[PDB]
């Protein structure tokens, strides 16, 4: 009866998604409504900044993409995908998109500000998380992928850099730049090298099973403190991924090793998440025996770690970046390419 309830919830969440998917919100704010405070992180197309909404006094995180840079890198369709998907989804562990708009130079997406910082920062500083701490995070991602995959979405860029910790110590998944809604197979070589499934590297055509492989890598990295395949050059990492060879640190519990062998399965027809029981093979695994899936979803479990928060607008959980001016050209750049944004 637990399985049937999940199934009904997902049926309704699909209907809500589809109405927004088919009729996307557009142009819901303007730049001059926001005071820009500080840069929170960077990427190849622009940056994410802490901003304050002047009419309400609320703080947000604003993602800014340079249209000319997106075109140069051939990321037009990926950028249109990102916004279209993010405006339509609704889940406790996904960052909420509040406004989007564009001007002559840039695209803008304004999301809830998540003050606890990136999982990456905390993981590097502590070294590694204990198995129960790792388990708490992993559960949230399992439920998030169950939601996403039921909507025909593939996420494709799971890693600690993309996972933000909120005030309550729960995860928010951000950065939907490679997410795609797709019923069959897809072929784009994208993602982060340490996290890529072998079928992506081998140019085979691939599906949602790549997210389950990436979850294997994440769980290993959280519990070990380093990823299962690392080297100084990406080409060297690819060699290791396809080889089929994983070593586990001696402190891994036998249950965790077992989970991991089934997620890091080079053979698609043997990989947990891609068998007939689907996500249930993962949720029913021994390693997750103590996880109350409903309590996690409702956010009722006490988090193992809560970040220090010193009031609204505090950025102490984030690194410092050099600040750059936002230049807005007097001529419209790339109008046709981004007309649907």
């Amino acid at each position: 009866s637990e399985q049937e309830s999940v199934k009904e919830f997902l049926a309704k969440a699909k209907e809500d998604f589809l109405k927004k998917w088919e009729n996307p919100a557009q142009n819901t704010a303007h730049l001059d409504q926001f005071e820009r405070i500080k840069t929170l992180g960077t990427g190849s197309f622009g940056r994410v900044m802490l901003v304050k909404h002047m009419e309400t006094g609320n703080h947000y995180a604003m993602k800014i993409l340079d249209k000319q840079k997106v075109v140069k890198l051939k990321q037009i369709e990926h950028t249109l995908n990102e916004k279209r998907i993010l405006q339509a989804v609704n889940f406790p562990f996904l960052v909420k998109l509040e406004f989007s708009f564009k001007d002559n130079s840039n695209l803008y997406m304004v999301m809830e500000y998540v003050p606890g910082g990136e999982m990456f920062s905390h993981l590097r500083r502590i070294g590694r998380f204990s198995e129960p701490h790792a388990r708490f995070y992993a559960a949230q991602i399992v439920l998030t992928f169950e939601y996403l995959h039921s909507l025909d979405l593939i996420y494709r860029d799971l890693k600690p850099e993309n996972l933000l910790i909120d005030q309550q110590g729960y995860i928010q998944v951000t950065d939907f730049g490679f997410a795609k809604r797709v019923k069959g197979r897809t072929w784009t070589l994208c993602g982060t090298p340490e996290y890529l499934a072998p079928e992506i590297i081998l140019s085979k055509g691939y599906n949602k099973a790549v997210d389950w492989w990436a979850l294997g890598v994440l769980i290993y990295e959280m519990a070990a403190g380093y990823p299962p395949f690392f080297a100084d050059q990406p080409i060297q990492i690819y060699e290791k991924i396809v080889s089929g060879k994983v070593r586990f640190p001696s402190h891994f519990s036998s249950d965790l090793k077992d989970l991991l062998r089934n997620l890091l399965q080079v053979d698609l027809t043997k990989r947990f998440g891609n068998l007939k029981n689907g996500v249930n093979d993962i949720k029913n695994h021994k390693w997750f025996a103590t996880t109350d899936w409903i309590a996690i979803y409702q956010r009722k479990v006490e988090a193992p770690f809560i970040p220090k928060f010193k009031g609204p607008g505090d950025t102490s959980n984030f690194d410092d970046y050099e600040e750059e001016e936002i230049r807005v050209s007097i001529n419209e750049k790339c109008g046709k390419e981004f007309s649907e944004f």
């Binding site: 190849s44 051939k74 070294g127 850099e161 070589l189 982060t192 090298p193 403190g225 690392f230 100084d232």
Partner: peptide
């Protein structure tokens, strides 16, 4: 140790996505 090998490696910082 593997941990020491990792910490001395070129990839302990934030990792960029690939597009190409």
């Amino acid at each position: 140790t593997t941990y020491a090998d990792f910490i001395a490696s070129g990839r302990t910082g934030r990792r960029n996505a690939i597009h190409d």
